[PDB]
Amino acid sequence: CKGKGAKCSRLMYDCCTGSCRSGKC
């Protein structure tokens, strides 16, 4: 996963601090 506002995916939600938001957590 990753920190908020970091690289993300709305199919993985590789956001430690949240969900994905158009490729940014």
UniProtKB/Swiss-Prot annotation:
Tissue specificity as recorded in UniProt: Expressed by the venom duct.
Lineage: superkingdom: Eukaryota
In-chain residues carrying the UniProt-annotated modification Cysteine amide: C25
Compartment(s) of residence: Secreted
Site (Binds Cav2.2/CACNA1B calcium channel): K4, R10, Y13, T17, S19, R21
Effect noted on mutating Y13R: Loss of inhibition of human Cav2.2/CACNA1B
Disulfide bonds listed in the record: C1-C16, C8-C20, C15-C25
Description of its domains: The presence of a 'disulfide through disulfide knot' structurally defines this protein as a knottin.
Sequence similarity: Belongs to the conotoxin O1 superfamily.
Functional note: Omega-conotoxins act at presynaptic membranes, they bind and block voltage-gated calcium channels. This toxin blocks Cav2.2/CACNA1B calcium channels (IC(50)=0.67-208 nM). It acts by neutralizing the outer electronegativity and sterically hindering the ion access path to the entrance of the channel selectivity filter. It also shows antiproliferative effects on different glioma cell lines (M059J, U-138MG and U-251MG). In vivo, is lethal to fish. In vivo, injection into mammals induces adverse effects, such as tremor, diminution of spontaneous locomotor activity and bad coordinated locomotion.
Listed name of the protein: Omega-conotoxin MVIIA
Organism: Conus magus
Origin organism lineage: Eukaryota, Metazoa, Spiralia, Lophotrochozoa, Mollusca
Residues of the full protein shown: 46 to 70 of 71
